[PDB]
Design a protein around this ligand. Structure first.
Ligand SMILES: C[S@@+](CC[C@H](N)C(=O)[O-])C[C@H]1O[C@@H](n2cnc3c(N)ncnc32)[C@H](O)[C@@H]1O
Ligand SMILES: C[S@@+](CC[C@H](N)C(=O)[O-])C[C@H]1O[C@@H](n2cnc3c(N)ncnc32)[C@H](O)[C@@H]1O
Ligand SMILES: C[S@@+](CC[C@H](N)C(=O)[O-])C[C@H]1O[C@@H](n2cnc3c(N)ncnc32)[C@H](O)[C@@H]1O
Ligand SMILES: C[S@@+](CC[C@H](N)C(=O)[O-])C[C@H]1O[C@@H](n2cnc3c(N)ncnc32)[C@H](O)[C@@H]1O
Ligand SMILES: C/C=C/C=C/CCC[C@H](C)C(=O)c1c(O)c(-c2ccccc2)c[nH]c1=O
Ligand SMILES: C/C=C/C=C/CCC[C@H](C)C(=O)c1c(O)c(-c2ccccc2)c[nH]c1=O
Ligand SMILES: C/C=C/C=C/CCC[C@H](C)C(=O)c1c(O)c(-c2ccccc2)c[nH]c1=O
Ligand SMILES: C/C=C/C=C/CCC[C@H](C)C(=O)c1c(O)c(-c2ccccc2)c[nH]c1=O
Ligand SMILES: [Cl-]
Ligand SMILES: [Cl-]
Ligand SMILES: [Cl-]
Ligand SMILES: [Cl-]
Ligand SMILES: [Cl-]
Ligand SMILES: [Cl-]
Ligand SMILES: [Cl-]
Ligand SMILES: [Cl-]
Ligand SMILES: [Cl-]
Ligand SMILES: [Cl-]
Ligand SMILES: [Cl-]
Ligand SMILES: [Cl-]
Ligand SMILES: [Cl-]
Ligand SMILES: [Cl-]
Ligand SMILES: [Cl-]
Ligand SMILES: [Cl-]
Ligand code: NA
Ligand code: NA
Ligand code: NA
Ligand code: NA
Lengths: 389, 389, 389, 389
């Protein structure tokens, strides 16, 4: 029986998944995708590409309605009628949306055709993750929609400039993306929520702090850690939590509105909040670690180089710049890192960088790679430690 | 070891897939998708929704470049540089596109970092399947991009009318989709190619023609099969191929430009090409089978009913209307049929119909269901045989 | 490809086995056996039954030669010639024995046609486990060889009596097995070694000792645990190890030659060694637990009842008799417990007992079951706690 | 859940087994055995070796009772009581035997504790396969039981002589096995039934007869095929069935009592029955094929050589001796061929032979190997074609 075979595959892959760690589960998931793509018929390939688009549109509708938050806190299954009436949605529309969501596990449909939350329901109810989905819909979709004709009309240029990529066509503007976004209050508000998401694991799981410090002295009033564009300060928080007795100032640098949003959740002491624009010279002199997490991927080389050149003059011989970012391999890169590469090309003019590309960029700033500490697999994020050449 | 476990999973799934038929492979593939969604982390869920969008955009670029057709006819692996120079693409852009494509199996990357075709490459090189992907990009994505704000602005109405859905917002028109498309030659050209795709399997794999025929006589000069909106006439061609000895007229009905396109590949004899607008009364009297394949799903009830009411007066007691279309279940419907439902709601105002919904529609035309012959699984397509009530 | 499928099956089963515990691995192993028997051809079934016999005979030869102990301490693969010369075996005989052993994993053969130890090699090198294999060869096989003609000659009687079973035919004696064995020094010597094997896990893994103890007082000088026929005293040793702070006498009871063998490995204090024949009245009065592990399975009902009736008069109201033995289910019993049943029927006239059969036996002694604490699965061993009725 | 995992393993291995051929299923079965042996605990290893012995003893009892034949023709499940009364067995004995048989799939136990035939029940009801099991019990078991002490008392000699192996100790005789068996009427009767079993597949599935014949002419009255020790003549029958129009005499040679038993099932014409002792000179001169299937494995080299030397003088340059027998590999031999090797060593003084060992034996008769045609895997049986040197 087909049904018996399918259920047996599910049982065995679930047991295997439970028996490994998060990195092993990520490897299994990538293999399931690869299997799916190799076993689909030609028609199925086009149907998948045609319809998987629906998920973000329907998640955006569920978010607008508050459906995922509401379902995540219901204690019993809800009918489509009950959901429609509670959330202010046409009843037939709600029923069709729910049937679609259940078919892609965005909710669960029960045997009596009522609806309960799934793992994905709970995910889309989390503010920061919801904001990620909303960002995909309102910022990524339009640049991807513009990219093919942008490239066709321009005879397939290498994209190298944040002011000359698909974003300008998609939003009918000559501004670059970051400048334009700063003029759009609802879009800024969504980024504020997005910053509350904290990725796990983080670089402290493999960063050999005591080894990298050696005999470094914090006196007088030297900074241990300067978190440049640190957002809510998650890296500073985790550093203080893991090494509470390590001397040295721990400093969160960001723009004033982000620092203001960070205050409610920062510790009352031990982490300084310092307004600082990272396109301007670094004020903190001689720090041990100048930390850039998921900053430089958003900039083409010219701008990324300028960000580094604003830090290098503040370094002493013991200082290090730590770039915590994606490091895709030379070959066999996975969809999460190549897809990111295409999206940030189209919106930002930037790119994912291999280790050798990071080293070439840093050498232009007078920096040499001393160590690289991977902390996620198989898609690699790593803390790259650079010193003055 | 975890690599070894992943390779063993692939080996076993590949072997189970080869030991079943196409319907069993479709069930396995849906299971792999369900497993993937249940094993992903919350972050991975949002990453997948954010990035799976990239595939249609990049497939559209490769189609514009002629990459898939070129790679499918190459006899040896090609470097990114070779492909970029041949196709007229910036070398860095080409390399980045190819790395993304290899990561989603749109091409395959070799250990030498060169590129060969995959199953998906070959699929996207086929004109009719390529046209389906291009249709998703240029027609479906704009209406899905418009749907959430359309619904929000209108306070979530049940969509019931082809003239009042997301299409009018997406394309800034008051026309319905079909009327607007007829004014857009480049889109018309893509639909012309899309009509050359023939779906497999088809209803003749399970339709018990001799049983449904009974003792119907083709004498003196009666019509066996009238293919209403038959496109290229594939159903007529397959009918004559499978039943070469059954007498009676076999008639392809469509609009003149489509009949003209059909002529080159119709048999030289045995199939008549009759121009006929199915919004007007059916001219062929007393045919055994009036066949509507994938026609009525494109219309809301009011218009679908009109199409049926145009046929009913031509029927005699032995005539049957055969609706060949999707028949999703009452519960547990799959993503291909619910995703289709959301898309045709958004572009056409129409809907997928369960068996009970098909029967209710047909009853309004004075028709009763006699038999239903499924021919695909697990997503249901079936030939529904209706007679006069 | 079929090689690849077989390797993938091994990889997946090995991984599932490592992800569970010993009871789950035992369930997997029984499943593999059931699969083997259902997939074999009729010829293969007869070949398996004909040849699996070879394993005990060849293990007995390797034990005689000292092969398993020698190979288990070798640091490099050994050739057949090296092993034959070292152990004093004909070179061709040795090579043929080793090829047979490697084919059933009793040793492993390398790609260079040399030999190293396997898990089974190490097992057969352990004195107590080796002695179990030697017991099967010299005591069990003769009684199984005699059983079919014993039954045929006697017209298939229910075997009820230790003095009238297959043992008397096998060994040409009118003595019962236990009485005969006491006259056979080489067999006695093997049993002495077999007693040093300690089974794992044991009842203390699940026995809720503090709950069963309640408020029992060891004062003034009462007995906590009387191990009746305790052999080397493993239960006493493990009890004192797990419950080092529970007061009360812990007493090992057995016959003098066995107590003398136990002395070298008993703790220096805390466990008394008391000679006692369990066919005579229990001398220790009012103990909390009188413990019988794998004793009563060796006796038919009449004699097993006598052993219990010898203990009952020593019991006070808080005393309990704890039978630790096999408890096969009413249906679906596994080969280890039914194979044991046939063997002890044939040698000893006794039987495995279900829970209901244990309760019926104990009721004849005036005892009632209070609790049953399973500690192995799927083959059931359990500590059954009985009190005065 | 363990039960869910185990059921899923069973489902997947059954589906994989169905999807391959008989040789692939044999490979899966050997892998399941290997998995079982590597995953068992040390105690489980000794319990398996101790108890798997029970299967042949209990099958012999079921055979004596007629249980397997009776159950194989019952149309409903039978209780132990019904079986006991019908077959003349003590009721408790029958119930215990059935529980044991069900635990090793020799019968099936139902949920209401009644009994139905399994695949193995049906196998043990087939006369020739039943006779194989009975042969294992009455002829193989005693020589295996005698082998360890035979080898110990003789200081581990290479066994090379049919008159000096374990058989003489086991049966207290100076005769060799074949001579002694010919004096034992019940044992002869069992061999008569055993000869009715026909192994599948056979050498004609891969033997390129037309290629090996070339331009061979059958005139005058030449023999195509002389089946030396051909038993019931299955090889002659299959040859005539597959090549009905091939000229040349087809001759079955065996001893008179076997030829007599063969007459009832031989074709009425086209196969000659010729009494002939293969320890005497071959009477048929110049035959194309002198065929020896499973003959020479039963003889030490000296006797096997004599059998060949009785044929070689009858050969002309076109004649071939075809040895159809086991050809174990140089390394990695499987249990069915090494177990056979140990059994025939112990009973017959003979041995399994690798290809190189067959060639060394045949060269002593003045023969050279021209071709070898395998027809079973992974345990190899092959038709080896030899010509005069
Ligand atoms: C991708 S978020 C990275 C946050 C943080 N590094 C982390 O991983 O937890 C980019 C951050 O850069 C900050 N940012 C953007 N432009 C900046 C600028 N010109 N100067 C300082 N911070 C800036 C944003 O406010 C935001 O917090
Ligand atoms: C989904 S397509 C092709 C379906 C076709 N029955 C098949 O399955 O092979 C719909 C068809 O309806 C035709 N069509 C659209 N409007 C029509 C009309 N008013 N009258 C007749 N045919 C029409 C199109 O030209 C097209 O060939
Ligand atoms: C299966 S063995 C060891 C069982 C032991 N209870 C254990 O599980 O560790 C049976 C024990 O009963 C002992 N035994 C046999 N007959 C006895 C008797 N009449 N009185 C006391 N002990 C006896 C043997 O000496 C042996 O130690
Ligand atoms: C293992 S059976 C093989 C039967 C046959 N070759 C087959 O594979 O179908 C051995 C055969 O050799 C025959 N045999 C034994 N001794 C013989 C002898 N001295 N001369 C001729 N046949 C003999 C037996 O009667 C029996 O038929
Ligand atoms: C909260 C969880 C979110 C899961 C997200 C997967 C994100 C994939 C996504 C392409 C991504 O990576 C990045 C961006 O979109 C952007 C950006 C920023 C502003 C405008 C457009 C794009 C910058 N830099 C990135 O890296
Ligand atoms: C060759 C394979 C092609 C796959 C194409 C996409 C299949 C999914 C896709 C939603 C689908 O089904 C349908 C349509 O898009 C449309 C339509 C027609 C015109 C405009 C917009 C939509 C009508 N009716 C449908 O049913
Ligand atoms: C009907 C199905 C039977 C399945 C059988 C597996 C048979 C294994 C079995 C050791 C085997 O092979 C052979 C013999 O016992 C003998 C023999 C013949 C006479 C006396 C003792 C042994 C000869 N020659 C063999 O080869
Ligand atoms: C170290 C592992 C050893 C495994 C040994 C074989 C386990 C199976 C085995 C049938 C078993 O269980 C029992 C006996 O043989 C006997 C016995 C004792 C004396 C003579 C004959 C049998 C008693 N009572 C049993 O229960
Ligand atoms: Cl929101
Ligand atoms: Cl809301
Ligand atoms: Cl660390
Ligand atoms: Cl095109
Ligand atoms: Cl829009
Ligand atoms: Cl299809
Ligand atoms: Cl026909
Ligand atoms: Cl549904
Ligand atoms: Cl020993
Ligand atoms: Cl006997
Ligand atoms: Cl155990
Ligand atoms: Cl304690
Ligand atoms: Cl049972
Ligand atoms: Cl018989
Ligand atoms: Cl009988
Ligand atoms: Cl052939
Ligand atoms: Na409802
Ligand atoms: Na409608
Ligand atoms: Na009894
Ligand atoms: Na019964």
């Amino acid at each position: 029986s087909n049904a018996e075979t399918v259920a047996a595959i599910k049982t065995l892959i679930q047991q295997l998944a439970q028996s490994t760690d998060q990195f092993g589960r990520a490897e299994i998931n990538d293999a399931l995708r690869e299997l799916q793509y190799s076993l689909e018929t030609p028609f199925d390939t086009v149907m998948r590409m045609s319809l998987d688009t629906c998920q973000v549109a329907v998640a955006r509708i569920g978010s607008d309605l508050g459906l995922f938050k509401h379902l995540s806190q219901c204690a019993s299954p809800q009918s489509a009628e009950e959901l429609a009436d509670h959330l202010g949605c046409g009843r037939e529309l709600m029923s069709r949306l729910l049937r679609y969501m259940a078919s892609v596990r965005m909710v669960q449909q029960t045997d009596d055709i009522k609806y309960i939350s799934s793992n994905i329901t709970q995910t889309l109810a989390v503010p920061g993750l919801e904001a990620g989905m909303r960002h995909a819909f309102e910022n990524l979709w339009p640049v991807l929609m513009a990219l093919p004709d942008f490239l066709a009309e321009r005879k397939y240029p290498d994209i190298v400039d944040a002011k000359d990529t698909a974003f300008q066509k998609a939003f009918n503007t000559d501004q670059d993306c970051f400048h334009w976004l700063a003029t759009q209050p609802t879009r800024i508000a969504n980024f504020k929520v997005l910053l509350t998401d904290e990725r796990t694991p983080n670089f402290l799981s493999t960063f050999p702090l005591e080894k990298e410090l050696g005999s470094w002295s914090a006196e007088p009033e030297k900074a241990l850690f300067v978190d440049i564009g640190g957002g809510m300060g998650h890296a500073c928080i985790r550093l203080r939590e893991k090494y509470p007795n390590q001397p040295g100032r721990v400093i969160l640098q960001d723009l004033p509105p982000v620092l203001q949003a960070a205050q409610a959740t920062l510790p009352l002491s031990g982490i300084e909040s310092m307004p600082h624009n990272f396109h301007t010279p670094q004020p903190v002199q001689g720090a041990k670690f100048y930390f850039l997490r998921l900053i430089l991927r958003d900039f083409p080389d010219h701008q990324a180089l300028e960000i580094l050149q604003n830090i290098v003059p503040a370094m002493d011989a013991e200082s290090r710049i730590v770039i915590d970012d994606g490091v895709p391999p030379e070959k066999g890169a996975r969809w999460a890192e190549t897809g990111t590469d295409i999206c940030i090309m189209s919106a930002l003019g930037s790119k994912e960088r291999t280790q050798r590309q990071w080293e070439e960029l840093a050498a232009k700033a007078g920096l040499q790679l001393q160590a690289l500490y991977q902390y996620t697999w198989p898609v690699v994020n790593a803390a790259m430690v650079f010193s003055l050449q």
